[PDB]
Ligand binder design. Structure first.
Ligand code: CLA
Ligand code: CLA
Ligand code: CLA
Ligand code: CLA
Ligand code: CLA
Ligand code: CLA
Ligand code: CLA
Ligand code: CLA
Ligand SMILES: CCCCCCCCCCCCCCCC(=O)OC[C@H](COP(=O)(O)OC[C@@H](O)CO)OC(=O)CCCCCCCCCCCCCCC
Ligand SMILES: CC1=C[C@H](O)CC(C)(C)[C@H]1/C=C/C(C)=C/C=C/C(C)=C/C=C/C=C(C)/C=C/C=C(C)/C=C/C1=C(C)C[C@H](O)CC1(C)C
Ligand code: SF4
Lengths: 85, 212, 41, 73, 203, 740
């Protein structure tokens, strides 16, 4: 089953979300979306200690992994809902 | 320190150790008032004395019952003694209330007024119905051998022994009651049954004790 | 324990206890002596 | 009370069964069922989806009273 | 203080405005107690399988750890000297004495060397700390005898305990899913690594 | 930074203050001198804002009180499961649900009450229950009385846990304020944890116990031969026998191949034709989707990490041209006041209850529920009433927030301010629409009455004469009946049978049949709309005119509860918001009485009845479309015709209802003394009787005083509601237990 079609969609969704967050696009723990979809800094965190030039956490892994899996389940069950895959 | 019923907790304030069998056991604080504690002292002593006497009765009658003498077991002796001799039940109960009421009322009004019955109202008796302490009515009738007025420290030892044996007897009679309710057989029969197979005859096998 | 007894000495508690006593007494009399209408005895 | 009482005693007299009064007059369900409920059968049938008869005006007054009364509250 | 690894993101070791059963001097004590019971239980869950596979105990035993009689639906063993209930009453009474006295040492430190307990009194004095009593019996041999070595032994106790706790959760999860022993799982996984995993055993 | 903040041992534990009644307030403490002081002791017991003036202490109080409420609920549930276990005929009911009526209460053989023990079937005697626990228990899979007894013991244990928890959190570990003021963490944990994980856990229980056991019970095997549920957990192959998807285990779930779970997670629509309830596979699928939805919704707010929303930002971003500054300042209102929260939560809670009632008659979820008529009527009626009371409570506590905790300095130009600033337009138009609906909705009935009495039935509003058709509701009815073919392609049937279609009959009786809507329905619906608008008028007027009005410019300084401001300026009786709540209670009674009458008669006329294989013979023959346009129609065909069973119940096993009927009337008429009269007269009469005691030296040293004005009114409305609702209760239960 590994290497099949749903695998590609799930890996693609998770890599897309994680690489979008780490590369300064998606809202992370540090950077926060405003009312006008603008990236501003966050306040009152837990004071994380983790080294990454973006300022990455163990929370964005969980967050963007969860978003990746929701998005991927949506896409897979949708494409199986149509009939094309 | 005194030995406490629960090593580590300090004893309550109203219990000191002047009493007999004082282990500081009172979680609900039922004896906080001194008069209430005094009354409960008398209650514990009386229950203990009837319990000791009763458990001796049960054990001796059962010993006579297992060996082939023809004694009934304690849940049957009332029926067979009332039935077998001639005795009418209610007249026996009424005479019980007569005598017990007389003596017990004397005790009650000796508690209310602590030295009142030593006046001479009863037939002629003076200072043989005067109490010694709370619940220790020692005179010529109740301490005929005369142990209370000699060897005072040894007498305190006797007080301690009385209270301990009384408490043990109270829970023993509770044992007889619940044991007969569970197994439906005589108590020393249960002792021999458990003594024959200890690992497989106990409370965890009746199916009535633990319904799991 | 004194304050617990005083709490038992308040009005509604004693009303509850005493009305339970009176109600139970009448109920027992009506069980053991079923259906009394007249006294004649 | 006096008029309910008089009216029912004379209804049972004029119909014929004084026994109904002397039995059902001693408990309030007797009044509610045997006076208010039984005797209001021809009243509220003063008009229906099937027709109407003489006592339609009374069967309209009978509701009129309630309306005034409830406004009174 | 042992085992402090800079962890705790959820913030439970804050002394400020703390109370009840969440405080530094009870959560640490709970960690060490859980660690000790977990070490003991882990070795106990493995031992019949490894001892029976090496041929040291007979085959009446060598039963899986959830089939001892803990879960009577999953399988019991007749051959104990009594019923498991008769065992359980003994367990109640003995553990009652032990755990209850331990509690009394926590609530009133040092108060376990006064009242007569068959002369066992110099043994139950405890010490300043509550999770490391010591004495002549809890510390038979004087292990370490100093301060520079004591922290090392406490730290090793903690790390082994944490490893044991994770291991015991593993035994529970595996016994739920695949329904076999832990040593059986080690044998099966060391046989075929790619063809035996957690994801192959999704059934 | 959201965290735990708890204080240690704030209030010690002693009986000392139990012997000192009225210890909580400064006014009450000094001891009685009149009999007003007793009623003041009971009136201000839970007024937690009237002991102190600090938020933290009030919050701790309400927290522990919540624990007390939960504990009593657990004692109640434990009682219900115990009485089901020991004093019922549940197993005899499982053996044959039809022809054996549910009974769960047994009375003692004393003065003659033993005639109340009815012949409920199954070799048992007792009082028929309509609470419908038996259908609930069969829906959960319970087959034995032993499991009920175990559940009872568990409930009692949880109750003791709750009371201990309350004691702990008031006396030993009491939280600080800023524990409470973290509403975002509370939202996350409630939405995720409580609702979501409860749904997920209950889905688990259904899938692993309730689906297979009910599949066997509906298959026809008697309940004893059915395997115990732990055999269903432990043995996979039995589940593989029942639903073959389980033979593949949990592999389909983790590889997104969910289509293989189509055996126990379905989407079929209507009902179980052999049972009369919903399909349990739908129910399990439903809770699974609910749990996923709520667990997704629970990660919305910011607690400790950068992700998530803030409530203040969301509120302050919404402001338009017509409303000035918008929502700026509602967060400070809704985190520092408890009465505002109680208002919102009671509102949505009560409305939720009424929706529960409606869905619960329309789509019967429990097995063998729809053919037990009494259960249907009782459940709908009960939830209707609870909803009504809760909504009136919402009105009352919104008023209390208006009086006490409103500060205009923190609240300047704002939605609340602007609502206060055009209350006159609001109330005037609400008054207009109330009068409009009044004239039309009730004058239609008066007109039909007049025309039907004047000899001309051709000039009245009916189905054959001048017609008023609810075209909108009929169109929506057809839309949803057609939905499974265009706008719901994957369902096999409609969501209910009231939208149209065929008939489901269980054991000769009708589970549900399509409901038609005619002219009588039009008129009664507008009656409902009318009474609802009137109640809204009263309550909203109370809220808006709680601080001040043109009549009284300083009504705020008199407080929430006060009787008048004298006979001056004409007379100012009943100007507090409290009296608006009072009159609101009366109108709530009226509106809900009409609602439950509508339901009862409509069901008895168009839905229920027996399938005699000669068409359908309903209970009352289907007279709703012809008679529900005349007040004479209601008074005759409903009240006079349907009371024959409650008035003739004497001598049978049903006489308790025919005896509580009259008592309900008595209390209703007893309320009128308190409503009509006034306290000066009673004060003088009580004074004369006090003289008659002064003569015989039995002067009470506490002083007899008549009730205060507000208390007299409150007692009046209490007796009024009690009598009316008890009458309706007795009537409904006697009727539908007798003929249903
Ligand atoms: C590739 C993208 C894609 C495609 C083709 C589909 C296609 C579909 N989705 Mg879908 N979905 C997607 C992404 C997609 N989705 C994403 C990213 C999410 C968010 C997680 C969802 C969440 C979603 C839900 C919640 C539902 C659908 C449903 C559906 C189906 C019917 C839609 C309807 O009733 O209107 C359809 C086959 C509906 C359905 O019935 O699924 C079969 C339905 O209930 N989808
Ligand atoms: C067996 C335990 C026991 C002990 C140690 C005591 C001890 C005491 N009792 Mg006591 N008592 C007991 C049982 C006991 N009692 C019972 C069961 C009753 C009920 C009948 C009483 C009724 C009683 C009264 C009415 C009085 C005492 C008094 C006393 C005090 C002085 C008398 C004495 O020492 O007796 C010594 C007792 C023994 C050495 C026990 C001998 C063992 C016997 C022989 C067992 C065999 C009999 C059995 C039927 C078989 C002393 C504190 C008197 C007191 O308070 O003095 C001020 C007093 O007035 N007791
Ligand atoms: C106010 C009017 C009134 C009167 C006069 C009675 C009188 C009576 N009722 Mg009655 N009842 C009433 C109101 C009344 N009740 C109400 C309002 C209800 C509804 C709650 C009932 C419901 C009711 C029931 C259900 C029953 C009665 C019964 C009785 C009779 C039992 C007498 C009794 O207690 O035994 C005699 C008790 C004693 C002698 C004990 C008194 C103790 C003192 C010390 C006696 C002193 C004597 C010197 C008695 C004739 C019972 C009966 O058999 O009916 C005939 C019965 O079954 N009643
Ligand atoms: C339902 C409402 C509620 C709420 C909001 C709280 C909130 C709180 N309680 Mg509390 N409590 C409650 C109910 C509640 N409790 C009840 C019902 C009891 C009686 C059993 C207690 C007994 C209790 C004690 C004895 C203590 C608290 C403490 C606390 C505080 C810290 C809790 C914490 O972080 O521990 C985190 C919680 C855990 C690590 C435990 C999680 C595991 C347990 C078993 C709970 C599992 C719950 C879950 C629903 C079980 C599902 C069953 C399934 C697994 C089969 C906090 C103020 C503590 C405190 O004041 O310290 C500051 C404290 O000492 N509470
Ligand atoms: C997953 C965690 C969780 C859960 C399950 C709950 C559940 C509940 N909270 Mg709650 N709460 C939480 C987190 C949680 N809260 C947090 C984090 C906070 C702080 C911000 C609060 C603050 C809070 C307040 C201030 C109040 C509640 C209240 C309630 C109860 C609402 C009554 C109801 O309908 O329950 C339905 C009944 C049940 C579901 C019965 C199950 C009850 C058991 C005990 C499950 C409880 C789980 C427990 C909270 C976990 C800790 C246990 C403790 C031993 C450590 C409900 C039991 C209200 C209440 O009733 O107070 C008592 C209330 O006033 N909560
Ligand atoms: C939330 C509720 C819930 C719960 C409790 C369960 C529970 C279960 N489901 Mg399940 N299920 C659910 C919801 C739920 N499900 C839903 C919503 C669906 C629909 C998608 C399914 C669909 C489903 C299928 C299709 C199947 C199950 C199965 C199972 C069982 C085995 C799970 C498995 O294979 O291992 C999962 C592994 C675990 C859950 C790990 C457990 C870890 C343990 C508890 C830790 C203990 C450790 C501890 C230290 C031990 C102490 C040691 C010492 C003190 C003694 C298990 C009883 C399977 C089964 O047996 O069928 C009958 C199966 O075939 N379920
Ligand atoms: C059955 C008795 C009754 C009636 C008819 C009313 C009527 C009314 N109450 Mg009401 N009320 C009552 C009992 C009643 N109440 C009781 C017992 C209480 C105590 C709780 C209250 C408490 C109460 C409050 C607190 C409020 C009302 C309000 C209203 C008005 C609502 C508007 C409306 O429908 O008017 C329309 C009028 C009718 C439906 C009456 C019938 C009209 C007929 C059908 C047609 C009239 C034409 C006529 C025949 C022509 C006259 C000809 C003649 C001159 C010859 C209305 C005047 C509310 C209000 O005024 O605000 C809107 C309001 O706030 N009442
Ligand atoms: C149901 C209607 C009803 C009833 C029962 C009464 C009853 C009474 N009225 Mg009247 N009244 C009414 C309607 C009613 N009124 C109305 C509508 C008005 C117009 C405003 C008045 C105006 C009025 C005035 C102006 C006066 C009275 C007076 C009286 C008393 C007359 C003495 C008497 O008969 O004692 C019999 C008493 C009773 C039958 C009361 C019932 C007691 C019950 C049976 C006992 C409780 C049973 C049980 C323990 C309850 C348990 C429940 C538990 C939760 C507590 C009496 C209390 C006069 C008075 O007090 O003179 C002394 C007086 O001055 N009333
Ligand atoms: C129609 C409603 C239009 C409402 C509408 O279009 O509002 C639109 C308008 C938009 O306001 P803003 O967007 O400027 O407000 C921003 C923030 O305050 C809220 O987003 O809201 C108002 O101005 C409130 C005016 C009250 C209007 C009162 C009308 C009352 C009608 C009540 C009867 C309803 C009958 C049907 C019930 C189902
Ligand atoms: C750190 C942290 C941090 C943050 O802040 C927060 C959080 C996250 C919360 C945290 C975490 C936590 C955790 C993870 C925990 C875990 C735990 C566990 C697992 C335990 C176990 C635990 C476990 C345990 C005790 C166990 C034990 C066991 C035992 C004894 C056993 C026994 C036995 C044996 C021998 C064998 C036999 O045949 C059977 C029996 C008899 C049965
Ligand atoms: S005292 Fe009574 S009548 Fe007078 S104004 Fe006040 S409420 Fe009205």
């Amino acid at each position: 089953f590994i290497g099949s079609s749903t695998n590609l969609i799930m890996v693609a969704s998770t890599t897309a979300t994680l690489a979008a967050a780490r590369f300064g696009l998606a809202p992370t723990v540090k950077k926060n979306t405003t009312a006008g979809l603008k990236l501003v800094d966050s306040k009152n965190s837990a004071g994380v200690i983790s080294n990454d030039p973006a300022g990455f956490t163990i929370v964005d892994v969980l967050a963007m992994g969860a978003a990746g899996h929701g998005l991927g389940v949506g896409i897979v069950l949708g494409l199986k809902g149509i009939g094309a895959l | 320190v005194r030995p406490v019923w629960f090593p580590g907790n300090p004893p309550p304030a109203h219990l000191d150790g002047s009493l007999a069998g004082d282990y500081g056991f009172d979680p609900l604080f039922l004896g906080q008032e001194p008069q209430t504690l005094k009354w409960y002292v008398q209650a514990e002593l009386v229950h203990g004395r009837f319990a000791m006497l009763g458990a001796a009765g049960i054990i001796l009658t059962s010993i006579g019952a297992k060996v082939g003498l023809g004694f009934p077991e304690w849940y049957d002796a009332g029926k067979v003694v009332v039935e077998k001799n001639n005795i009418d039940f209610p007249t026996l109960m009424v005479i019980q209330f007569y005598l017990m009421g007389w003596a017990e009322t004397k005790r009650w009004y000796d508690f209310k007024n602590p030295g009142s019955q030593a006046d001479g109202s009863f037939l002629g008796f003076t200072e043989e119905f005067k109490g010694l302490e709370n619940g220790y009515p020692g005179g010529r009738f109740f301490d005929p051998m005369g142990l209370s007025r000699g060897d005072a420290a040894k007498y305190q030892e006797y007080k301690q022994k009385e209270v301990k044996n009384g408490r043990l007897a109270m829970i023993a009679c509770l044992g007889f009651a619940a044991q007969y309710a569970a197994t439906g057989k005589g108590p020393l029969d249960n002792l021999a049954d458990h003594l024959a197979d200890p690992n497989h005859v106990n409370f965890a096998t009746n199916g009535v004790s633990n319904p799991i | 324990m004194k304050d617990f007894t005083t709490y038992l000495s308040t009005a509604p508690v004693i009303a509850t206890i005493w009305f339970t006593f009176t109600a139970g007494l009448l109920i027992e009399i009506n069980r053991y002596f079923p259906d009394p209408l007249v006294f004649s005895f | 009370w006096v008029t309910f009482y008089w009216h029912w005693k004379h209804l049972t007299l004029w119909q014929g069964n004084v026994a109904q009064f002397d039995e059902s007059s001693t408990y309030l369900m007797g009044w509610l069922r045997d006076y208010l409920w039984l005797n209001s059968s021809q009243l509220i049938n003063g008009y229906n989806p099937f027709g109407m008869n003489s006592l339609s005006v009374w069967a309209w007054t009978f509701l009129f009273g309630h309306l005034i009364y409830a406004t009174g509250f | 203080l042992p085992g402090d690894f800079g962890f705790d993101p959820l913030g439970l070791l804050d002394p400020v405005n703390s109370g009840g059963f969440i405080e530094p001097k009870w959560l640490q004590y709970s960690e060490v107690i859980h660690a000790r019971w977990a070490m003991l239980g882990a070795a106990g869950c493995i031992a019949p399988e490894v001892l029976g596979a090496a041929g040291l105990i007979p085959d009446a035993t060598n039963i899986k750890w959830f089939e001892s009689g803990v879960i009577p639906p999953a399988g019991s063993y007749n051959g104990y000297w009594a019923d498991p209930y008769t065992i359980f009453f003994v367990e109640i009474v003995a553990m009652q004495f032990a755990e209850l006295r331990r509690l009394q040492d926590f609530r009133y430190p040092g108060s376990m060397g006064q009242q007569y307990f068959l002369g066992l009194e110099a043994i139950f004095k405890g010490s300043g700390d509550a999770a490391y009593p010591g004495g002549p019996f809890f510390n038979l041999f004087n292990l370490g005898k100093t301060e520079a070595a004591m922290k090392e032994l406490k730290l090793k106790e903690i790390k082994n305990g944490r490893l044991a706790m994770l291991a015991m959760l593993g035994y529970g999860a595996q016994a739920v899913m695949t329904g076999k022993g832990p040593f059986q799982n080690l044998v099966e996984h060391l046989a075929d690594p790619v063809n035996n995993n957690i994801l192959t055993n999704f059934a | 930074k959201v965290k735990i903040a708890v204080d240690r041992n704030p209030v010690e534990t002693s009986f000392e203050k139990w012997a000192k009644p009225g210890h909580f307030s400064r006014t009450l403490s000094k001891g009685p001198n009149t009999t007003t002081w007793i009623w003041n002791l009971h009136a201000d017991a839970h007024d937690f804002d009237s002991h102190t003036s600090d938020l933290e202490e009030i919050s701790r109080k309400v927290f522990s009180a919540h624990f007390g409420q939960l504990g009593i609920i657990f004692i109640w549930l434990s009682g219900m499961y115990f009485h089901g276990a020991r004093f019922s005929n549940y197993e005899a009911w499982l053996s044959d649900p039809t022809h054996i009526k549910p009974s769960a209460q047994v009375v003692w053989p004393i003065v003659g009450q033993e005639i109340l023990n009815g012949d409920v079937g199954g070799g048992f005697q007792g009082i028929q229950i309509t609470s419908g626990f038996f259908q609930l228990w069969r829906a959960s899979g319970i087959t034995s009385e032993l499991q009920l007894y175990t559940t009872a013991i568990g409930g009692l244990v949880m109750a003791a846990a709750m009371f201990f928890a309350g004691w702990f959190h008031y006396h030993k570990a009491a939280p600080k304020l800023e524990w409470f003021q973290n509403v975002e963490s509370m939202l996350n944990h409630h939405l995720g944890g409580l609702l979501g994980l409860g749904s997920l856990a209950w889905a688990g229980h259904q899938i692993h116990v309730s689906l297979p056991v009910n599949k066997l019970l509906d298959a026809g095997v008697d309940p004893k031969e059915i395997p115990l549920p732990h055999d269903l957990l432990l043995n996979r192959a039995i589940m593989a026998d029942l639903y073959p998807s389980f033979a593949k285990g949990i592999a389909p779930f983790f590889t997104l191949n969910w289509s293989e779970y189509s055996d126990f997670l379905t989407f079929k629509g209507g009902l179980n034709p052999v049972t009369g309830g919903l399909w349990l596979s739908d129910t399990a699928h439903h809770h699974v989707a609910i749990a996923v939805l709520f667990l997704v919704a629970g990660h919305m707010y910011r607690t400790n990490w950068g992700i998530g929303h803030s409530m203040k930002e969301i509120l302050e971003a919404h402001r338009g041209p017509f409303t000035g500054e918008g929502h700026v300042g509602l967060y400070e209102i809704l985190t520092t006041s408890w009465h505002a929260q109680l208002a919102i939560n009671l509102a949505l809670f009560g409305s939720l209850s009424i929706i529960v009632a409606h869905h619960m008659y329309a789509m019967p979820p429990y097995p063998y529920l729809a053919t037990d008529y009494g259960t249907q009527l009782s459940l709908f009626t009960h939830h209707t009433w609870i909803g009504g009371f809760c909504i009136v409570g919402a009105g009352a506590h919104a008023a209390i927030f208006m009086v006490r905790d409103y500060d205009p300095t923190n609240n300047y130009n704002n939605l609340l301010d602007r609502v206060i600033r055009h209350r006159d337009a609001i109330i005037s138009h609400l008054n207009w629409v109330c009068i409009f609906l009044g004239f039309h909705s009730f004058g239609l009935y008066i007109h039909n009455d007049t025309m039907s009495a004047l000899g001309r039935p051709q000039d009245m509003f009916s189905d054959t004469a001048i017609q008023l058709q609810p075209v909108f509701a009929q169109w929506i009815q057809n839309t949803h009946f057609l939905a499974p073919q265009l706008t719901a392609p994957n369902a096999l049937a409609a969501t209910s049978l009231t939208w149209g279609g065929d008939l489901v009959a269980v054991g000769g009786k009708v589970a549900m049949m399509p409901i038609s809507l005619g002219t009588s329905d039009f008129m009664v619906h507008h009656i409902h709309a009318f009474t609802i608008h009137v109640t809204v008028l009263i309550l909203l007027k109370g809220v808006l005119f709680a601080r001040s009005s043109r009549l009284i410019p300083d009504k705020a300084n008199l407080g929430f509860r006060f009787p008048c401001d004298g006979p001056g300026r004409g007379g100012t009786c009943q100007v507090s918001a409290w009296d608006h709540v009072f009159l609101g209670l009366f109108w709530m009674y009226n509106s809900l009485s009409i609602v439950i009458f509508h339901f009862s008669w409509k069901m008895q006329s168009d839905v229920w009845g027996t399938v005699t294989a000669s068409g359908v013979s309903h209970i009352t023959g289907g007279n709703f479309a012809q008679s529900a346009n005349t007040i004479n129609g209601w008074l005759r065909d409903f009240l006079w015709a349907q009371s024959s069973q409650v008035i003739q119940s004497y001598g049978s096993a049903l006489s308790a209802y025919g005896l509580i009927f009259l008592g309900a009337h008595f209390v209703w008429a007893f309320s009128l003394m308190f409503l009509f009269s006034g306290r000066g007269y009673w004060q003088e009469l009580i004074e004369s009787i006090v003289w008659a005691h002064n003569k015989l030296k039995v002067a009470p040293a506490i002083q007899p005083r008549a009730l205060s004005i507000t208390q007299g009114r409150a007692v009046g409305v209490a007796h009024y509601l009690l009598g009316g609702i008890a009458t309706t209760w007795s009537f409904f239960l006697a009727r539908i237990i007798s003929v249903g």
